[PDB]
């Protein structure tokens, strides 16, 4: 059989993984609730590189209109979860 | 940039509802409540069909002219016929360029 | 390939044409020519059902190979001498055809050389 | 022939004296029984037709047509009783009476010995059909459709009446046997040219010939389901049967009087097949397909060879079964969603799988897949046409391609993709509908095993 | 045979797939070498190709241009 | 069953072509902040990969050894 | 700078290459807002019936009905005999018929006068 | 050709299924070690497709090229056949180089 | 897919979308990770060169000629994620998605199996039936007189209210429904 059903917890661990592999983000001060522009001091192009990293992570593409608003890791977790039909 | 308050609140409410629905699509431990020899394959799938076909060809199809035609068998110099006991002479003493 | 280069770029008058060949008699330059013989009879090639293009001057070796393959059937690797013999006969047939080609080419060159140069010795 | 005919007539008072809730049961049972008895006309002598009496006779051309008629009646009853449920008892009995009278007229027309009786019955079929269309038709457009169906038909058939009475005055008889044995060549004169036209145009408009075909989309689309079934399966074949009978007194004139009709039929084959590619209505598409098939039959009859006559017979029968099946399939969905538009309901294979299987099989016989009898007829006609002229293959070849195209287009549009989100009233298939489809399809498949039965007199 | 994912690491390998893969690759190469040892003619040719310029006119039957 | 992620602290671009990219970009006044995300494609079991000709010649050693064994047996067998 | 892309009928012009979407005026923005509003009013009207619990059946679409009516029944009421209509009708209607008549008549005349000559290779042609 | 072309398709299928239904070779990295048996099979199939000696492809294709070389044939057809014989080697090389050599280019959940 | 669109895209949105497209097509051209990473940093730099331009006209012309460059230099065969609108698996599982209203046409013998699922479904149906009128009334309350202006929907605001028009969003089939 194929891959086991995704669990929100594995999702969120993975998003945090890619986020601390990003050079412009402080690992010891990044949280699941950290705003990208406001708390971490990034601009729109950093946020675009971040969504592209997330699609490279989870192997599925995110539409531009929807992404414009994924401004914290929790929002990315919620988007991926509601897209791939994970409740827990 | 980002969601508006109403957008985020509605996404949260829809998310809770959707996750409850997906949770309730699960089956309970009893859900499908259903109401109330080693060589057997080679004999019914190979042996029986070849009995019917060989019977059909031997006594029905070959009971009429020109239904099963086999190209006549090759004959070579030095061969011996089975019916007549003929012998076809061999072939003219090759120049033997050994 | 060189023959194609000679025919299509050089003077095609000096090259044999594969469709119309030979144009010279078979007894022209030779004093005596022995005509090619056959080892297999028509009836043998008919009883073997060889093929109409395998019924050339090498067909007796083909009958050898075919009978020997049918005789030693399970050992499909025992008909080596027969295969080599048929191959060798075919190779000699092919070099005969090459000699025919070469023979034709020289005659055309020779004929052109002699005819137009007797025209040379006649123009003065 | 009396043994088949009297019971059919009996069906009339049997349905008029039945209880209100047993009309469909009784009519279906005894229609099926009549169909079984008719099945016995397929035994044919060989050299000549079976002449029961002075008035009636059966042929190898005739036998297949009669069996198809009698078999189509119970299927029409099964298809009708759903949309006629709200109707009063008297009007349901009147509808069944119309269907029975139509069957009776049809059986007699095919077996009449002489042309005047054939003409009278061939024309009598107009009244029940018109009543069915205009009284039980769903749309407002049915009245216009009825007028088109009537007038196109009579404008062709009245010159035929004049020609027939003239021919009996000059020959002394219209009996088909005497007509055949005493046949003499038609000279090349203006009088004979117009006699030829008057003998041919009625059957041409019945087929229909391309350009005189406009009544058919109207009438076949605006009719109730049983009306459409009988209009496509049987009533189109009156033209082919009549032409095959009448062309015996027309030689040798047909040799060149057939040219414009052959041109019209081949090019209009291409035309109606192309039309099927851009059609928004699903019944309209099936109607034009019928036109395309009958163009092929017209070519086969006009070129007058034994292979072409055999192909024409086989194609008539196969078309009659396939076209009725396609109309019933469309009607099931219409009953669900109350619209004829083809893109309204999509992805129906996800909701109705067995009906999707019926759709696939009907679409496969429509494009004449070997070794179905649709392809047998089409291939025989194409070979005869090739002998007639080798350039016909281009037109024939083109037609085969366009037919595959629109058949699979219809299948893909209605069955595949995703279902329309809004429509939520698509209930499971009823046993009645599945049995109706099977009773269309099983006979067609069975016919492949014994091809000679539908081949005809020439065989 | 239960193999579980590994997330950014080289996947878990069993001994069976390695032994089978290496066995069959080695089989192919052994077969090629065996054949070329026994049937090198099928690749290199067996009969010599003649050179037409090696051909005298006595065997080839043309006269010396004076007749 | 129920694995979790290796430590993100290990993915370092030194010794990998990402280091060369980093230095060639520093030679321009630029920098790549995503190299540690790709470092796993070079770190572990994907450290060393074969070339094309070395891949075509996969089982050549065992095959040649078996071939020489068999032809030596041929050398030594027809001597009866 | 770079070679230019020119559109055609069956390969249209991309939106990012359209000079019209880079020359924006306030009237353009008001037009876009009007279009969005029309789309929005239609979407709400559809979703109010789509989500209705008590609604069973097929929601009827007047745009689809207008399309099918225009494609079938409204065509003849809006037809005029015009030089273009008449010439196109004559061409596409009777041109092909006469073309095919010429082709087939020519072919069959050739074949028949060839049969009269005793020259056609008709051996083995029993079936027709 | 039936044998080794069916095998090539089955190898591609095993790759596609292992890489979460991905078919673009630009996202297939170093599988020469990760999928050893699939690699062995696809290499042997590529060598049969290219006419490696004493292989199934060799008897069928090498004889065909030999017969096309030595017959009274259209010259352009012969030239195109030879160029295509080179092209076959090139595409086979592209699949192996792109799909089996190099570093991984697929998502991280292996 | 999930968000209501706006009447138009701002200059900033167009610029971000062009950035993403250029990066993806560059990755398609630059197969390997290191080379793509290098050229993507060069791209980001060339993009940042005009980051702080104040003249809207020149910014628009920069965007326009950048789009022309992208079109001339795009990949004829860019990488697509398999379930994306051009992917090889885009609509692969649409034949397995069955609407939930089909479950009401099941035979009682079919519903005899799965009693708990169908009890819970009756609960969900009760919930929808008892929420509908409040949803309609709320939508009529919160909507301007000249009809709605965007495709945006309000959340629930009271105690036991549900977000209006939620049934067909909550009861989607699934994305791997079988
Ligand atoms: C060639 C094979 C030989 C097999 C031997 C046994 C065959 C017995 C079958 C008898 C006739 C079939 C009846 C047709 C109606 C289907 C009834 C149904 O609803 O199925 C429900 C049943 C229950 O399934 P389910 O799980 O409940 O769900 C079903 C879903 O609806 C959906 O399920 P599904 O997706 O599986 O769909 C059902 C199926 C059924 O749908 C069909 O289309 C089946 C009919 C085939 C096409 C029909 C028109 C084409 C013209 C051909 C005419 C040939 C007739 C010959 C005489 C037949 C006598 C009846 O559809 C298909 O499988 C695809 C059809 C494509 C067939 C293409 C073949 C072309 C011609 C092949 C050779 C024909 C000449 C034979 C001799 C040649 C020289 C030796 O499903 C089946 O049983 C499957 C049917 C078996 C497939 C038969 C296909 C080939 C047979 C053709 C005629 C037989 C010739 C026998 C002579 C000896 C040889
Ligand atoms: C839209 C679908 C409608 C249905 C299609 C109906 C098709 C009807 C067409 C009839 C086919 C041909 C009719 C007669 C055959 C030849 C016609 C004539 O043109 O041929 C020449 C005739 O010569 C001249 O053409 C005279 C006829 C010209 C006058 C007729 C007017 C034609 C104009 C077209 C009007 C359209 C008619 C259909 C109305 C809808 C032959 O020369 P000739 O050997 O000397 O005459 C043979 C007769 N003989 C032996 C008694 C002497
Ligand atoms: C739904 C549309 C269908 C339209 C069909 C219309 C065409 C029908 C065919 C022609 C109709 C009239 C034919 C007359 C009936 C045949 C009778 C006959 O053969 O007698 C002829 C008589 O022939 C005629 O008189 C016919 C002349 C035509 C009169 C009516 C003209 C109507 C229009 C004619 C052309 C239309 C026909 C084709 C149109 C097809 C439909 C588009 C010879 O007899 P005698 O007078 O004794 O001559 C020899 C002794 N001296
Ligand atoms: C191989 C594939 C083909 C690739 C070819 C593509 C060629 C691309 C060349 C480069 C394109 C340009 O310079 S385009 C020149 C456009 N100039 C401007 O936009 C100046 C004003 N800046 C702003 O508006 C914002 O700061 C903004 C920058 C949007 C960020 O905003 P955030 O920080 O708030 O997200």
PDB file of C-alpha atoms in Angstrom, chain D residues 197-384:
ATOM      1  CA  UNK D 197     -40.748  10.174 -60.609  1.00  0.00           C
ATOM      2  CA  UNK D 198     -44.350   9.596 -59.523  1.00  0.00           C
ATOM      3  CA  UNK D 199     -43.531   5.973 -58.696  1.00  0.00           C
ATOM      4  CA  UNK D 200     -40.432   6.905 -56.688  1.00  0.00           C
ATOM      5  CA  UNK D 201     -40.997  10.200 -54.832  1.00  0.00           C
ATOM      6  CA  UNK D 202     -43.424   8.883 -52.190  1.00  0.00           C
ATOM      7  CA  UNK D 203     -40.955   6.259 -51.036  1.00  0.00           C
ATOM      8  CA  UNK D 204     -38.179   8.844 -51.274  1.00  0.00           C
ATOM      9  CA  UNK D 205     -39.983  11.164 -48.875  1.00  0.00           C
ATOM     10  CA  UNK D 206     -40.707   8.242 -46.531  1.00  0.00           C
ATOM     11  CA  UNK D 207     -37.036   7.252 -46.205  1.00  0.00           C
ATOM     12  CA  UNK D 208     -36.320  10.303 -46.066  1.00  0.00           C
ATOM     13  CA  UNK D 209     -34.147  11.429 -48.959  1.00  0.00           C
ATOM     14  CA  UNK D 210     -31.809  14.279 -48.048  1.00  0.00           C
ATOM     15  CA  UNK D 211     -33.455  17.663 -48.665  1.00  0.00           C
ATOM     16  CA  UNK D 212     -36.962  16.256 -48.155  1.00  0.00           C
ATOM     17  CA  UNK D 213     -35.997  15.199 -44.664  1.00  0.00           C
ATOM     18  CA  UNK D 214     -37.056  18.260 -42.653  1.00  0.00           C
ATOM     19  CA  UNK D 215     -40.233  16.652 -41.326  1.00  0.00           C
ATOM     20  CA  UNK D 216     -38.278  13.944 -39.508  1.00  0.00           C
ATOM     21  CA  UNK D 217     -36.398  15.938 -36.823  1.00  0.00           C
ATOM     22  CA  UNK D 218     -39.641  17.738 -35.966  1.00  0.00           C
ATOM     23  CA  UNK D 219     -41.844  14.647 -35.843  1.00  0.00           C
ATOM     24  CA  UNK D 220     -39.346  12.306 -34.169  1.00  0.00           C
ATOM     25  CA  UNK D 221     -38.378  14.881 -31.545  1.00  0.00           C
ATOM     26  CA  UNK D 222     -41.871  16.116 -30.656  1.00  0.00           C
ATOM     27  CA  UNK D 223     -43.475  12.676 -30.397  1.00  0.00           C
ATOM     28  CA  UNK D 224     -43.996  10.640 -27.230  1.00  0.00           C
ATOM     29  CA  UNK D 225     -41.533   7.825 -26.706  1.00  0.00           C
ATOM     30  CA  UNK D 226     -43.589   5.062 -28.343  1.00  0.00           C
ATOM     31  CA  UNK D 227     -44.409   7.316 -31.276  1.00  0.00           C
ATOM     32  CA  UNK D 228     -40.684   7.961 -31.808  1.00  0.00           C
ATOM     33  CA  UNK D 229     -39.900   4.264 -31.467  1.00  0.00           C
ATOM     34  CA  UNK D 230     -42.371   3.251 -34.156  1.00  0.00           C
ATOM     35  CA  UNK D 231     -41.484   6.219 -36.384  1.00  0.00           C
ATOM     36  CA  UNK D 232     -37.803   5.301 -36.453  1.00  0.00           C
ATOM     37  CA  UNK D 233     -37.932   1.501 -36.291  1.00  0.00           C
ATOM     38  CA  UNK D 234     -40.693   0.649 -38.780  1.00  0.00           C
ATOM     39  CA  UNK D 235     -42.280   3.636 -40.504  1.00  0.00           C
ATOM     40  CA  UNK D 236     -39.054   4.670 -42.230  1.00  0.00           C
ATOM     41  CA  UNK D 237     -38.817   1.160 -43.687  1.00  0.00           C
ATOM     42  CA  UNK D 238     -42.077   1.552 -45.608  1.00  0.00           C
ATOM     43  CA  UNK D 239     -40.142   3.648 -48.109  1.00  0.00           C
ATOM     44  CA  UNK D 240     -37.424   1.044 -48.531  1.00  0.00           C
ATOM     45  CA  UNK D 241     -39.846  -1.861 -48.853  1.00  0.00           C
ATOM     46  CA  UNK D 242     -42.026   0.014 -51.331  1.00  0.00           C
ATOM     47  CA  UNK D 243     -39.045   1.075 -53.420  1.00  0.00           C
ATOM     48  CA  UNK D 244     -37.662  -2.467 -53.514  1.00  0.00           C
ATOM     49  CA  UNK D 245     -41.051  -3.676 -54.727  1.00  0.00           C
ATOM     50  CA  UNK D 246     -41.729  -0.903 -57.240  1.00  0.00           C
ATOM     51  CA  UNK D 247     -38.343  -0.794 -58.970  1.00  0.00           C
ATOM     52  CA  UNK D 248     -39.235  -3.945 -60.933  1.00  0.00           C
ATOM     53  CA  UNK D 249     -41.406  -2.043 -63.410  1.00  0.00           C
ATOM     54  CA  UNK D 250     -38.920   0.830 -63.723  1.00  0.00           C
ATOM     55  CA  UNK D 251     -36.034  -0.795 -65.647  1.00  0.00           C
ATOM     56  CA  UNK D 252     -34.015   0.229 -67.646  1.00  0.00           C
ATOM     57  CA  UNK D 253     -34.762   3.884 -66.857  1.00  0.00           C
ATOM     58  CA  UNK D 254     -33.344   3.645 -63.320  1.00  0.00           C
ATOM     59  CA  UNK D 255     -29.891   3.433 -64.923  1.00  0.00           C
ATOM     60  CA  UNK D 256     -29.857   7.213 -65.276  1.00  0.00           C
ATOM     61  CA  UNK D 257     -32.883   8.451 -63.342  1.00  0.00           C
ATOM     62  CA  UNK D 258     -31.056   7.397 -60.161  1.00  0.00           C
ATOM     63  CA  UNK D 259     -28.149   9.841 -60.545  1.00  0.00           C
ATOM     64  CA  UNK D 260     -29.581  12.860 -58.659  1.00  0.00           C
ATOM     65  CA  UNK D 261     -30.939  10.689 -55.855  1.00  0.00           C
ATOM     66  CA  UNK D 262     -27.575   8.968 -55.467  1.00  0.00           C
ATOM     67  CA  UNK D 263     -25.803  12.330 -55.349  1.00  0.00           C
ATOM     68  CA  UNK D 264     -28.271  13.673 -52.794  1.00  0.00           C
ATOM     69  CA  UNK D 265     -28.046  10.554 -50.648  1.00  0.00           C
ATOM     70  CA  UNK D 266     -24.241  10.357 -50.554  1.00  0.00           C
ATOM     71  CA  UNK D 267     -23.576  14.036 -49.952  1.00  0.00           C
ATOM     72  CA  UNK D 268     -26.461  14.269 -47.481  1.00  0.00           C
ATOM     73  CA  UNK D 269     -25.083  11.262 -45.664  1.00  0.00           C
ATOM     74  CA  UNK D 270     -21.990  13.368 -45.056  1.00  0.00           C
ATOM     75  CA  UNK D 271     -24.166  16.394 -44.248  1.00  0.00           C
ATOM     76  CA  UNK D 272     -26.450  14.819 -41.637  1.00  0.00           C
ATOM     77  CA  UNK D 273     -23.549  13.009 -40.001  1.00  0.00           C
ATOM     78  CA  UNK D 274     -21.711  16.335 -39.679  1.00  0.00           C
ATOM     79  CA  UNK D 275     -24.883  17.935 -38.305  1.00  0.00           C
ATOM     80  CA  UNK D 276     -24.931  15.342 -35.531  1.00  0.00           C
ATOM     81  CA  UNK D 277     -21.581  16.741 -34.320  1.00  0.00           C
ATOM     82  CA  UNK D 278     -23.089  20.125 -33.363  1.00  0.00           C
ATOM     83  CA  UNK D 279     -26.442  19.272 -31.796  1.00  0.00           C
ATOM     84  CA  UNK D 280     -27.617  20.582 -28.446  1.00  0.00           C
ATOM     85  CA  UNK D 281     -30.669  18.300 -28.250  1.00  0.00           C
ATOM     86  CA  UNK D 282     -30.208  14.587 -27.636  1.00  0.00           C
ATOM     87  CA  UNK D 283     -33.270  13.378 -29.573  1.00  0.00           C
ATOM     88  CA  UNK D 284     -32.367  15.624 -32.480  1.00  0.00           C
ATOM     89  CA  UNK D 285     -29.011  13.842 -32.702  1.00  0.00           C
ATOM     90  CA  UNK D 286     -30.615  10.363 -32.903  1.00  0.00           C
ATOM     91  CA  UNK D 287     -33.061  11.581 -35.556  1.00  0.00           C
ATOM     92  CA  UNK D 288     -30.336  12.912 -37.849  1.00  0.00           C
ATOM     93  CA  UNK D 289     -28.410   9.673 -37.367  1.00  0.00           C
ATOM     94  CA  UNK D 290     -31.447   7.820 -38.667  1.00  0.00           C
ATOM     95  CA  UNK D 291     -31.391  10.091 -41.709  1.00  0.00           C
ATOM     96  CA  UNK D 292     -27.749   9.255 -42.380  1.00  0.00           C
ATOM     97  CA  UNK D 293     -28.432   5.519 -42.174  1.00  0.00           C
ATOM     98  CA  UNK D 294     -31.425   5.716 -44.528  1.00  0.00           C
ATOM     99  CA  UNK D 295     -29.319   7.619 -47.054  1.00  0.00           C
ATOM    100  CA  UNK D 296     -27.135   4.524 -47.199  1.00  0.00           C
ATOM    101  CA  UNK D 297     -30.259   2.408 -47.767  1.00  0.00           C
ATOM    102  CA  UNK D 298     -31.389   4.706 -50.600  1.00  0.00           C
ATOM    103  CA  UNK D 299     -28.042   4.290 -52.358  1.00  0.00           C
ATOM    104  CA  UNK D 300     -28.266   0.513 -51.971  1.00  0.00           C
ATOM    105  CA  UNK D 301     -31.743   0.375 -53.495  1.00  0.00           C
ATOM    106  CA  UNK D 302     -30.899   2.720 -56.363  1.00  0.00           C
ATOM    107  CA  UNK D 303     -27.887   0.760 -57.612  1.00  0.00           C
ATOM    108  CA  UNK D 304     -29.992  -2.426 -58.025  1.00  0.00           C
ATOM    109  CA  UNK D 305     -27.594  -5.296 -57.346  1.00  0.00           C
ATOM    110  CA  UNK D 306     -28.147  -8.468 -55.300  1.00  0.00           C
ATOM    111  CA  UNK D 307     -25.460  -7.487 -52.782  1.00  0.00           C
ATOM    112  CA  UNK D 308     -26.954  -4.016 -52.405  1.00  0.00           C
ATOM    113  CA  UNK D 309     -30.438  -5.429 -51.810  1.00  0.00           C
ATOM    114  CA  UNK D 310     -29.097  -7.844 -49.198  1.00  0.00           C
ATOM    115  CA  UNK D 311     -27.226  -5.035 -47.464  1.00  0.00           C
ATOM    116  CA  UNK D 312     -30.298  -2.816 -47.564  1.00  0.00           C
ATOM    117  CA  UNK D 313     -32.462  -5.451 -45.883  1.00  0.00           C
ATOM    118  CA  UNK D 314     -29.907  -6.108 -43.149  1.00  0.00           C
ATOM    119  CA  UNK D 315     -29.368  -2.397 -42.532  1.00  0.00           C
ATOM    120  CA  UNK D 316     -33.104  -1.703 -42.331  1.00  0.00           C
ATOM    121  CA  UNK D 317     -33.587  -4.329 -39.623  1.00  0.00           C
ATOM    122  CA  UNK D 318     -30.479  -3.389 -37.641  1.00  0.00           C
ATOM    123  CA  UNK D 319     -31.307   0.310 -37.773  1.00  0.00           C
ATOM    124  CA  UNK D 320     -34.838  -0.383 -36.563  1.00  0.00           C
ATOM    125  CA  UNK D 321     -33.569  -2.106 -33.433  1.00  0.00           C
ATOM    126  CA  UNK D 322     -30.685   0.275 -32.680  1.00  0.00           C
ATOM    127  CA  UNK D 323     -32.627   3.497 -33.219  1.00  0.00           C
ATOM    128  CA  UNK D 324     -35.468   2.365 -30.996  1.00  0.00           C
ATOM    129  CA  UNK D 325     -32.970   1.460 -28.271  1.00  0.00           C
ATOM    130  CA  UNK D 326     -31.286   4.869 -28.497  1.00  0.00           C
ATOM    131  CA  UNK D 327     -34.608   6.701 -28.266  1.00  0.00           C
ATOM    132  CA  UNK D 328     -35.582   4.719 -25.164  1.00  0.00           C
ATOM    133  CA  UNK D 329     -32.201   5.422 -23.563  1.00  0.00           C
ATOM    134  CA  UNK D 330     -32.608   9.156 -24.125  1.00  0.00           C
ATOM    135  CA  UNK D 331     -36.152   9.039 -22.761  1.00  0.00           C
ATOM    136  CA  UNK D 332     -35.054   7.542 -19.431  1.00  0.00           C
ATOM    137  CA  UNK D 333     -32.820  10.541 -18.739  1.00  0.00           C
ATOM    138  CA  UNK D 334     -35.498  12.918 -19.973  1.00  0.00           C
ATOM    139  CA  UNK D 335     -37.905  11.342 -17.496  1.00  0.00           C
ATOM    140  CA  UNK D 336     -35.338  12.019 -14.775  1.00  0.00           C
ATOM    141  CA  UNK D 337     -34.442  15.645 -15.544  1.00  0.00           C
ATOM    142  CA  UNK D 338     -37.303  16.911 -17.767  1.00  0.00           C
ATOM    143  CA  UNK D 339     -35.075  18.459 -20.428  1.00  0.00           C
ATOM    144  CA  UNK D 340     -33.705  17.266 -23.744  1.00  0.00           C
ATOM    145  CA  UNK D 341     -30.481  19.306 -23.659  1.00  0.00           C
ATOM    146  CA  UNK D 342     -27.480  17.014 -23.855  1.00  0.00           C
ATOM    147  CA  UNK D 343     -25.108  18.925 -21.542  1.00  0.00           C
ATOM    148  CA  UNK D 344     -27.661  19.333 -18.745  1.00  0.00           C
ATOM    149  CA  UNK D 345     -26.960  15.975 -17.119  1.00  0.00           C
ATOM    150  CA  UNK D 346     -23.356  14.792 -17.224  1.00  0.00           C
ATOM    151  CA  UNK D 347     -21.298  12.004 -15.699  1.00  0.00           C
ATOM    152  CA  UNK D 348     -24.280   9.669 -15.459  1.00  0.00           C
ATOM    153  CA  UNK D 349     -22.028   6.594 -15.406  1.00  0.00           C
ATOM    154  CA  UNK D 350     -21.154   7.475 -11.813  1.00  0.00           C
ATOM    155  CA  UNK D 351     -24.833   7.418 -10.856  1.00  0.00           C
ATOM    156  CA  UNK D 352     -26.284   4.733 -13.172  1.00  0.00           C
ATOM    157  CA  UNK D 353     -23.749   2.052 -14.136  1.00  0.00           C
ATOM    158  CA  UNK D 354     -25.927  -0.579 -15.830  1.00  0.00           C
ATOM    159  CA  UNK D 355     -27.662   2.097 -17.885  1.00  0.00           C
ATOM    160  CA  UNK D 356     -24.177   3.231 -18.904  1.00  0.00           C
ATOM    161  CA  UNK D 357     -23.519  -0.298 -20.144  1.00  0.00           C
ATOM    162  CA  UNK D 358     -26.708  -0.152 -22.207  1.00  0.00           C
ATOM    163  CA  UNK D 359     -25.554   3.220 -23.554  1.00  0.00           C
ATOM    164  CA  UNK D 360     -22.183   1.795 -24.567  1.00  0.00           C
ATOM    165  CA  UNK D 361     -23.687  -1.190 -26.366  1.00  0.00           C
ATOM    166  CA  UNK D 362     -26.219   0.957 -28.229  1.00  0.00           C
ATOM    167  CA  UNK D 363     -23.459   3.368 -29.255  1.00  0.00           C
ATOM    168  CA  UNK D 364     -21.300   0.462 -30.426  1.00  0.00           C
ATOM    169  CA  UNK D 365     -24.009  -0.980 -32.643  1.00  0.00           C
ATOM    170  CA  UNK D 366     -24.782   2.500 -33.986  1.00  0.00           C
ATOM    171  CA  UNK D 367     -21.219   2.859 -35.296  1.00  0.00           C
ATOM    172  CA  UNK D 368     -21.489  -0.658 -36.798  1.00  0.00           C
ATOM    173  CA  UNK D 369     -18.945  -2.667 -34.855  1.00  0.00           C
ATOM    174  CA  UNK D 370     -18.154  -6.098 -36.339  1.00  0.00           C
ATOM    175  CA  UNK D 371     -19.636  -8.564 -36.396  1.00  0.00           C
ATOM    176  CA  UNK D 372     -22.966  -6.848 -35.711  1.00  0.00           C
ATOM    177  CA  UNK D 373     -25.589  -6.869 -38.442  1.00  0.00           C
ATOM    178  CA  UNK D 374     -25.325  -3.079 -38.718  1.00  0.00           C
ATOM    179  CA  UNK D 375     -21.839  -3.587 -40.124  1.00  0.00           C
ATOM    180  CA  UNK D 376     -23.002  -6.530 -42.236  1.00  0.00           C
ATOM    181  CA  UNK D 377     -25.528  -4.318 -43.992  1.00  0.00           C
ATOM    182  CA  UNK D 378     -23.190  -1.350 -44.254  1.00  0.00           C
ATOM    183  CA  UNK D 379     -20.325  -3.471 -45.613  1.00  0.00           C
ATOM    184  CA  UNK D 380     -22.496  -5.158 -48.232  1.00  0.00           C
ATOM    185  CA  UNK D 381     -23.820  -1.801 -49.419  1.00  0.00           C
ATOM    186  CA  UNK D 382     -20.303  -0.346 -49.501  1.00  0.00           C
ATOM    187  CA  UNK D 383     -19.028  -3.255 -51.599  1.00  0.00           C
ATOM    188  CA  UNK D 384     -21.888  -2.964 -54.080  1.00  0.00           C
TER     189      UNK D 384
END
